[PDB]
Structure 1
């Protein structure tokens, strides 16, 4: 039907080659132009050129190949944003070794979980993540080799990427004669991203599709010379990962920050003549509060982007206003879709439109029937960036992605007559009660760890506000105490009249499930 929204034709058609071959080709070209900046560390002010980057990545690929890694192996890159981050990443993509970026503020257990899924043979780690990695290594025997990222010399008995390279490169190695590995880009996994979190396996193909979006004048950035991006987002997460890979294809200057600071951020936008800035959603709310913005020459700034993270119309508008932009670039994407598949086209709080290569439909929550215009239903997407599946979790894979290839997002959305998508009150006796407001009240009680509010169905009152509560460990609390507590804080219409159902986990809040549990226990 016309109830499947489909992305238009891309400006740059999907190119043949693995993601590693496409990156090598692009990077080798910029490398041949002396002084072309690939990355700039805003904190230390150091620039690293494409020639430096290309040559180091090529040497790492060859050294890892010589060492013995192939498509049967995975590496983990565990580091805060740095000039060094993408070296092992590029190196591994060039030879078809899967890269599993591990969150650098993960404690040792989150780190252990992550790595337990990715089962890396070699781990690249920044100096400050070494202890954690040594402790994870104790437990994961597959980790044979630890390599220090931000060191030139060996560091604490471990080789740096430079000494490792020197250990395995053949004599007379020539970075410009190196030819990347060619392999099936559909079967060969580029990135294993973290979404108990799961490993999302992403074949080279999804990166190659992303490379088309990255330079799309509508769905990405037009490749203009001297384009600079200020990136504050984590490189180990899909937003930072896939925008950066795309920027490297485009020859852009990626200015990185690993620690947010207001002045450094705005001074960087100005001094580096940044055209495009990337922020996590909570930095958007932050900038809605900033009064320093006008002190800076941000004449080059054209875009502030949220990636696959949707923002409220209000926060987005507040931030566009503060930066005197007509809007904000947002979108919707999941770890499981590589990057955003609904993006604000160039030219409300519409999350954007379907990206080239993709199709999106919303289905009835009950029946799964594909719904039409401005009808709310579950957002499902189908396209070449959808993951291959969860690493060693086919069940979870099958529950998310159907037999026709549609990924069931679990999110509710609808599309207007222009194909703009939008991502999306309990009524007690006519009176409106926003569950979020009762949840905030419940969350702020010392005995309550987590709470989800939904309307227990009660035809006489229409809907009774009820809650599922996860208690704080060691803390005991009765339904009465919780209902009383709420009543003491809210107007009569907002009282928790439907009660509490104590759960261990609150199903974004799956309101339908919260509702389900309420009906099972209550009636």
Structure 2
């Protein structure tokens, strides 16, 4: 019923302050994020600057918390500028699956109804196309161009309009607000209902997530200035949050878009990557590989998942094959931010579990093992413009009703 004792106390403020501080702190990291496919690089100090300027720009452009902005890109090195900026101001951000149907995108976007949309070069036509069908979508800004594209502004142009040459990110202040109430992200999944909906994620969810990535047992124990590999889609809770927690711990990131097979091996070997986070299919590819042994995976200290590899000893397959310690396992994870109670190689902080009282509602003891429920500040505050599914998923007094006994 109570979880473990946090080894790092949750940052009391907003997610933006933690990130801002993390970027000011680790500014000296030159190999900040690298595009494995194009060898393009970005330094922490670049991101620091870009996010701060963009925050100011978003403000002076005239947006506040009652607004909502959106980003739509494939895994991209410039994904994080706008995201962190929105967190600075406290403007809720909505991520978008870069591979949606036109139909899907219009639905998804009709949930949060963003006034501003950031997107990649690659995604730009799609987004203009869709923008025709939504009257609320005022501005679109391209994230990986230094020049405007057919009248569509790029982040640089935009930011230039609102900040000068002498701007200093160090003299910048992120807004302050209740991290438990203020929506950081509005992410969208499909449930049993089969309708899109769209999930609210508070800042405090993120700062707790950060505690976890810091935990020496259930998190990463990798030292700063060390390369990790990011592959999961940044528009999923998995990819976004696992990637976001890279900055406060100060890790160098090498980034891969989709699978590509063995490319995702060339990369580990060649960048000397220490940790990898990966979904189950990647893990099974790891267990069962036609001559994986042609690459020198020797740097791979840590391996992690998020999708539950049911069994068939795949965690063992990967543990034994690559000389890596036990792999993070236990408990199946939900879209709300996923990671909840699990076990290293032994054989969750800010998280509770509830067992007593099938037809009642108050107890504090984990003895008999009846029905199970969850209460953490890291949980979705609910779905967006749909007060109904929020109550059906999470109850009347803050607990969340899981499913089994």
Of 278, 285, 309, which aligns to 1:311? 309
| 1:120-179 Cα distance to aligned partner (Å, 9 max, x none) | 110001122223222332222221001112211011321111111112225642222111
Aligned partners of 1:380, 1:131: CA distance in 2, in Å? 45
Q: 1:295 to 1:373 in 2, by over 3 A?
A: farther
Query: What is the CA RMSD across the aligned residues, in angstroms?
Result: 2.3
Query: Which residue matches 1:164?
Result: 158
Verify: 1:335 aligned to 2:341, yes or no.
Answer: no
Partner secondary structure for residue 140 of structure 2:
strand
2:276 corresponds to: 277
1:176 equivalent among 146, 150, 170: 170
Using the TM superposition, give the Cα deviation of residue 296 of structure 1 relative to its aligned residue in structure 2, in angstroms: 2.2
User: Residue in 2 aligned with 1:142?
Assistant: 136
Matches of 1:129 and 1:268 in 2, distance apart? 25
- The reply on whether 1:232 has 2:226 as its aligned counterpart is no
Match of 1:345 in 2: 344
Residue 191 of structure 1 aligns with which residue? Answer: 185
Structure ranking higher on relative contact order (CA contacts 8 Å, 6+ apart): 2
Counterparts of 1:405 and 1:106, CA distance in 2: 33
Could you tell me which runs of 5 or more consecutive residues in structure 2 were left unpaired when the two chains were aligned: 190-194
Question: Counterparts of 1:407 and 1:75 in 2: how far apart (Å)?
Answer: 28
Q: Is the counterpart of residue 22 in structure 1 residue 18 in structure 2?
A: yes
- Whichever structure has more strand as a proportion of its residues is 1
Change (3 A) 1:45 1:374: farther
Counterpart of 1:10? 6
> Gapped runs of 5+ residues in structure 1?
349-354, 414-523
Match of 1:71 among 56, 65, 68: 65
Are 1:382 and 2:399 an aligned pair? no
Q: What TM-score comes out, normalization by structure 2 length?
A: 0.91
Indicate the residue corresponding to 1:320 in structure 2.
319
The answer to whether the 8 Å contact 2:218/2:328 transfers is no
Please give the alpha-carbon distance, in whole angstroms, between the structure 1 residues aligned to 2:361 and 2:236.
31
Alignment of 1:47-66 (within 5 A): 47-66=41-60
* Displacement of 1:87: 0.8
**Aligned with residue 403 of structure 1, among 368, 392, 396:** 396
**Normalising to structure 1: TM-score of the pair?**
0.71
Deviation for aligned residue 1:357: 0.5
Q: In the TM superposition, what is the alpha-carbon distance from 1:326 to its structure 2 partner?
A: 4.3
Report the alpha carbon displacement of residue 363 of structure 1 after superposing the two structures with TM: 6.7
The answer to whether the Cα contact below 8 Å between 2:222 and 2:274 also exists between their aligned partners in 1 is no
Distance 1:332 1:167 in 2: 47
CA distance in 2, matches of 1:104, 1:356: 33
Residue deviations 1:317-347 (CA, integer Å, cap 9, x gap): 33333334343224533222x2312233364
Distance 1:152 1:397, change over 3 A: same
Evaluate the alpha carbon distance shift between residue 144 and residue 297 of structure 1 in structure 2; reply closer, same or farther with a 3 A threshold: same
Question: What is the SS of the residue equivalent to 1:286?
Answer: helix
Give the Å deviation of 1:76.
0.9
- C-alpha contact 1:26 1:248 (8 A) present in aligned 2: yes
Q: Is the 8 A contact 1:332 1:342 kept in 2?
A: no
After superposition, give the CA deviation of every residue in 1:192-226 in whole Å (9 maximum; x if it has no partner).
Answer: 11122221111111111111111110121125133
Larger Rg: 1
How far, CA to CA, are the matches of 1:288 and 1:372 in structure 2?
A: 36
